[PDB]
Paper text:
We previously showed that LJ0536, a cinnamoyl esterase purified from L. johnsonii N6.2, is active towards a variety of substrates including short acyl chain aliphatic esters and phenolic esters. The structure showed a canonical α/β fold characteristic of esterases, and the enzyme is dimeric. Two classical serine esterase motifs (GlyXSerXGly) can be recognized from the amino acid sequence, and the structure revealed that the catalytic triad of the enzyme is formed by Ser106, His225, and Asp197, while the other motif is non-functional. The structure revealed a prominent inserted α/β subdomain of 54 amino acids, from which multiple contacts to the aromatic acyl groups of the substrates are made.
The apo-LJ0536 structure was crystallized in the presence of protease, which facilitated successful crystal growth (the mutant Ser106Ala was also crystallized in the presence of protease). The resulting fragment included a loss of four C-terminal residues, such that nearly the entire full-length protein was visible in the electron density map (1–245, plus the five residues from the expression tag). The asymmetric unit of the apo-LJ0536 crystal contained two protein molecules that formed an extensive interface. This interface is formed by α4, α6, and β1. As calculated by the PDBe PISA (Protein Interactions, Surfaces, Assemblies) server, which identifies interfaces between proteins by measuring their buried surface area, the dimer interface comprises 34 and 37 residues of chain A and chain B, respectively, burying a total of 2373 Å2 between the two chains. The interface is primarily hydrophobic (18/37 residues from chain B), although there are six salt-bridges as well. Due to these characteristics, this interface is presumed to be the dimer interface of the protein. The presumed catalytic pocket resembles an open canal-like feature, which has the shape of a boomerang that ends in a hydrophobic pocket buried between the α5 and α6 of the inserted α/β subdomain. Overall, we observed no appreciable differences in the backbone structure between the apo wild-type (WT) enzyme and the Ser106Ala mutant (RMSD of 0.33 Å over all 244 Cα atoms). The inserted α/β subdomain of LJ0536 adopts the same conformation in the apo and ligand-bound structures, suggesting that this is a rigid structure.
Residue numbers in the entry:
A (entry chain B): 2 to 245
B (entry chain A): -5 to 245
Amino acid sequence: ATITLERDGLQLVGTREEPFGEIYDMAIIFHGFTANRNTSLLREIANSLRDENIASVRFDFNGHGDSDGKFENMTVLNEIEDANAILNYVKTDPHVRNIYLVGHSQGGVVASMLAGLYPDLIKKVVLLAPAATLKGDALEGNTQGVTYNPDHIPDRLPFKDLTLGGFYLRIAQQLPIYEVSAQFTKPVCLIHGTDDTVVSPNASKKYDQIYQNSTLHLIEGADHCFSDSYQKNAVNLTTDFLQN
Amino acid sequence: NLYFQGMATITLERDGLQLVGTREEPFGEIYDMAIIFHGFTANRNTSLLREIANSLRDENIASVRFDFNGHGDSDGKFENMTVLNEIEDANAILNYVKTDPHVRNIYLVGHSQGGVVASMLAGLYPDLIKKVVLLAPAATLKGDALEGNTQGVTYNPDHIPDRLPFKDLTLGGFYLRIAQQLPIYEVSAQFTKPVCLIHGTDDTVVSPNASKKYDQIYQNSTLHLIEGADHCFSDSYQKNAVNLTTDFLQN
Ligand code: NA
Ligand code: NA
Ligand code: NA
């Protein structure tokens, strides 16, 4: 049902997907930049794993969806602290046996980098279109088509309908994404479609070259938010990988 | 402001928590500002932090010092404190400091762990920060975490626990994993602007080579190897550190 946690005086609200039994494995589903806990792609990954004896938890990040916090004061950094607060709960739960991390878009950087700091704890990582391009993007003064000077990052910038802060782009510019991630040497699943416009498939190609044990799945024709017909495939690879 | 000058108690907000602080104002309605960071298990009002705050005001330079999360009057469990979220604490102070009418230039100052917080925020904010003063900066903490002995307390650095008992409190295991992979030198090195480094020869807490590696890595460094001095600039040495911090920020 709807479960609740805390990270430095901010409430983190999530949907736990629970299977039948006393002992089960559990996955932590992280969403991307401007996304929320319960979207089509994540909701179906959440559902699918439950049918195969795996539990799951999806939470809104600080400044996203139902959780507390301003979007203005959100960073990939404070999002990893959110990711750690969820892991504190998950690793302290009596029913939870083996932990997995599944991350789409920016949540793909949040999950890989959280797995970099917890390689001894996390048993598997499924990386769907990981937004590791967000560093090289912030460094060239262009994020999702919204510009700035990478040597003059303002206090706040209008983004679509929202307003993100400078500190987000300060951190993004000097994030040791691959560095921290390469610390995770256990199984990794990489899912990236050739038709991705937001995040380049070269982020997943870079990720594969740096991992010890990683499978690269380049699904021909698949977009960024793994839409329509391409969804069931993505969900199938995540499910098949997480049980094996 | 010139009217409300001397000392003040200020309360900031950072992603849910409350960071209680101390503001020292000089005379005139346009002055320079120093952000003062204390180190590991300490607070904003210790003899050294108090004498740097007083001394800079006696040269008409304002100062701000806050307790980090899990320290002093600031909110949060000591268990949930990492180096990373102290930078978040620091950024929040900078969000306050950069949006103040009377603030001419910003200066970053940090002792021990505050020194990492200072070098690491100075590198994320090079266009704003004008000068940086690092007193025995605890960059060693990363190497102390890779080894598995933080301030004498042993632990497996490959199987770091959830929480681990400390001197009087309980240290979070995510702090250990955080500092063990902290890009201290990487981020620090981005600051090309003037850096003043102060380290004690007889320091057993932070190896003086931390300030030497700092000095090495910086484009505009000035190292001061105060002889006989320990980690906490005290007695015949406090007066030496406070002056250098003042004199380098004196124009
Ligand atoms: Na349910
Ligand atoms: Na149990
Ligand atoms: Na970092």
